Design a binder for this molecule. Structure first.
Ligand SMILES: CCC(=O)N(c1ccccc1)C1CCN(CCc2ccccc2)CC1
Ligand SMILES: CCC(=O)N(c1ccccc1)C1CCN(CCc2ccccc2)CC1
Lengths: 113, 113
């Protein structure tokens, strides 16, 4: 019952910037991860950036260093800042929510020397 | 109701390799993402690798290129292959499941020359 609304798309010139926004509404209290995906012409949809509740972020290799994901927790908004755009960035961009579950008990790894 | 069990931790020699496994049980039909996390002594727990149902993977900067996450869908197992271990990798490692939701309608971005 999460609802996601993406905005900010449009036309850019190569070397330009855009900022996308994703507004979540509905019952969002359990949502503790958010992601931006893109579908370039002809290709599989791919994760380009994600952010979790602790503020940790991860990016795909194709956008790492150029794109930045950030969030406004008080308004349930997630942003995608896209810098140094290329024609290879042309795509439909999608927002997606996630509910990350419980952890296991864990396993100790000890590296010596 | 999903239950996760991590195994395969132990003592590794500097520069050695380890393979961790995480077995999921319970009602797993909706689980469409899995992640490995680690908790270095004194520090926040951190994502190090994640995999989704389409086989896409993502890694933290600290492990990208050394660690590989893979899955056996038929047995509900995920694995973390850890190579060239150093003392900086000593930690408790945890598995975590996730349910990723619907996408939004998407927003077109078109970059020209
Ligand atoms: C990692 C993402 C994350 O954890 N969230 C998030 C989700 C989408 C977009 C931005 C952030 C939280 C979801 C729950 N909301 C709280 C409850 C609420 C309800 C209505 C208005 C304001 C707040 C805080 C942020
Ligand atoms: C990216 C993760 C993912 O999508 N999954 C997954 C989850 C945990 C660990 C490995 C993979 C699927 C979850 C549902 N199972 C299906 C049914 C079933 C039941 C009992 C035994 C075997 C299979 C297929 C794999």
């Amino acid at each position: 019952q999460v609802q996601l609304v993406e905005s900010g798309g449009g036309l850019a010139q190569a070397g330009g910037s855009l900022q996308l926004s994703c507004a979540a509404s509905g019952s969002t209290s359990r949502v503790n991860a958010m992601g931006w995906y893109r579908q370039t012409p002809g290709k599989e949809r791919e994760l380009v950036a994600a952010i979790d509740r602790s503020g940790a972020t991860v990016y795909s290799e194709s956008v790492r260093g150029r794109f930045t994901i950030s969030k406004n927790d008080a308004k349930n908004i997630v942003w995608l800042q896209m810098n140094n755009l290329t024609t290879e960035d042309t795509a439909v961009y999608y927002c997606r929510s996630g509910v990350l579950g419980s952890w296991g008990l864990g396993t100790q790894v000890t590296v010596s020397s």
